[PDB]
Design a protein around this ligand. Sequence first.
Ligand SMILES: *[C@](C)(CO)CCOP(=O)(O)OP(=O)(O)O
Ligand SMILES: *[C@](C)(CO)CCOP(=O)(O)OP(=O)(O)O
Ligand SMILES: [Mg+2]
Ligand SMILES: [Mg+2]
Ligand SMILES: [Mn+2]
Ligand SMILES: [Mn+2]
Lengths: 176, 180
Amino acid sequence: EHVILLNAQGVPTGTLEKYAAHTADTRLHLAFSSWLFNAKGQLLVTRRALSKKAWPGVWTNSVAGHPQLGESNEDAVIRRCRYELGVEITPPESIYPDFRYRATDPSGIVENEVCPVFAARTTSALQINDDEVMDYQWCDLADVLHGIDATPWAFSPWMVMQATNREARKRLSAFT
Amino acid sequence: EHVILLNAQGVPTGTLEKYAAHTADTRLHLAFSSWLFNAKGQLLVTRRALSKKAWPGVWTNSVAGHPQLGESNEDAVIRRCRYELGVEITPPESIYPDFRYRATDPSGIVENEVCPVFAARTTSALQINDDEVMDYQWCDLADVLHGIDATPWAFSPWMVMQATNREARKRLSAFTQLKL
Ligand SMILES: *[C@](C)(CO)CCOP(=O)(O)OP(=O)(O)O
Ligand SMILES: *[C@](C)(CO)CCOP(=O)(O)OP(=O)(O)O
Ligand SMILES: [Mg+2]
Ligand SMILES: [Mg+2]
Ligand SMILES: [Mn+2]
Ligand SMILES: [Mn+2]
């Protein structure tokens, strides 16, 4: 498992093993983020396990990860959905293609990522991997957005940025 | 370091070392909770360190803990503000003296408490103890209660229980006024 190093524009230039890649000095690399809703249209919010190297125990959007060499983003989303949440989904759709971001977690670990965002529908029940997810909630995107809007700090900075982007937010609410 | 065990009545019967006291079988014990406001009237919200035995890495109100033998609840609040936040405060005001709660944390640790709740004002800078607190925010009370109303699952339930109590809530409003 690797992350794909990106140059100034997003051209891959190499790889690092995923664990060695996330440090206090994390270099720019490829990523994705996805927002999952159920058939009923509830938003799935997850809490990252205490063993995640970056933002452990943080409430965030449904699923995020790092596409591997030669892997489509949509495939990356599907893979991590199965891996973290043991869940099957509809074909992921673009919600925030240009999302890119850098931040530092309370322990000083950095994530530095070009991160296209997607939305999709689960088509199966969840089967949680507790090495990745320590908790989750099915809720209403409206309340979730109220929450991000009221107390952003209660949530991952990445989740907050995606939901604060006008386009992404409008797309998530129409997805719903 | 211990907790003060209480019988069915809220009456002390002795003590138990703190760590050992908090398990899946936690006995009723004495505790406290405090909501801290700075001079501006902003509420301090904190994120419990990852190493906390109960609700590690969870967002909650400013400070909480266990009064020790011979110590008053109010001196408890004061000591813990110093210990966890390194911050001095005004005399803790009682805002929810009869709060009592039981809850199981994401890993099964139970907390079972008689937990009088206080509010105070800080009178010094923070010196966060990262053995106890991994993150904090200064914010507007109304915002926090909106976050609490919207996604209550994103916070420790104790903060939520205390905050949805009408009088404790009104008392907390009193501390949002600026004060020099
Ligand atoms: C970037 C947006 C956030 O760091 C996505 C990375 O997700 P993460 O869950 O940390 O990666 P994995 O461990 O591959 O799931
Ligand atoms: C009861 C309200 C919550 O469990 C107070 C105990 O909180 P905690 O901060 O975990 O106690 P200490 O470890 O003594 O600080
Ligand atoms: Mg992930
Ligand atoms: Mg405490
Ligand atoms: Mn990464
Ligand atoms: Mn306790």
